């Protein structure tokens, strides 16, 4: 940013601090799990935020271990197309650790615009039981 100097405003006489719940990995052929944390404002208001965790999926970024694999680069990430490609090749195959002989992979080097500061959004995203209406 060109603005700089962030850090939101804070008020003394807080109500409670961020309480974090345990992330639900979800599970389901590699599904995105989420964690929910909530806090009360200084004037005691229900504040909440949800985070997305990581799910251990089969076949990770480990194209080798006891086996031998080399990644080569015919070119560096292409910003013009916002794409990146890399080639790999088997250097040695073991008796109980075999590898593919070559791999070619292309992954978008760029990304779509993903805002960091989320708006208030729909507070009715999840159905909740608001006690005594609003106190009246």
Swiss-Prot record:
The keyword Cytoplasm does not apply. Residues 115-136 are annotated as: Chondroitin sulfate A binding. Residues 107-136 are annotated as: Disordered. One of its GO terms (molecular function) is chondroitin sulfate binding. Phosphorylated by NEK6. One of its GO terms (biological process) is regulation of hemopoiesis. Transmembrane segments: none annotated. Belongs to the pleiotrophin family. Interacts with ALK and NEK6. Interacts with PTPRZ1 (via chondroitin sulfate groups); promotes formation of homooligomers; oligomerization impairs tyrosine phosphatase activity. Forms a complex with PTPRZ1 and CTNNB1; this complex inactivates PTPRZ1 protein tyrosine phosphatase activity through PTN interaction and stimulates tyrosine phosphorylation of CTNNB1. Interacts with ITGB3 and ITGA5. Forms a complex with PTPRZ1 and integrin alpha-V/beta-3 (ITGAV:ITGB3) that stimulates endothelial cell migration through ITGB3 'Tyr-773' phosphorylation. This is Pleiotrophin. It comes from Homo sapiens (Human). The lineage of its organism: Eukaryota, Metazoa, Chordata, Craniata, Vertebrata. The chain holds residues 33 to 168 of 168 of the full protein.
């Amino acid at each position: 940013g060109k603005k700089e100097k962030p850090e939101k405003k804070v008020k003394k006489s807080d109500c409670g601090e961020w309480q974090w719940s345990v992330c639900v990995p979800t599970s389901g052929d590699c599904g995105l799990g989420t964690r929910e944390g909530t806090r009360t404002g200084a004037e005691c208001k229900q504040t909440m935020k949800t985070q997305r965790c990581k799910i251990p999926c089969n076949w990770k970024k480990q194209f080798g271990a006891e086996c031998k694999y080399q990644f080569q680069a015919w070119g560096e990430c292409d910003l013009n197309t916002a794409l990146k490609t890399r080639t790999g090749s088997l250097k040695r195959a073991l008796h109980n650790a075999e590898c593919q002989k070559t791999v070619t992979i292309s992954k978008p080097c760029g990304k779509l615009t993903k805002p960091k500061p989320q708006a208030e959004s729909k507070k009715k995203k999840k159905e909740g039981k608001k006690q005594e209406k609003m106190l009246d």
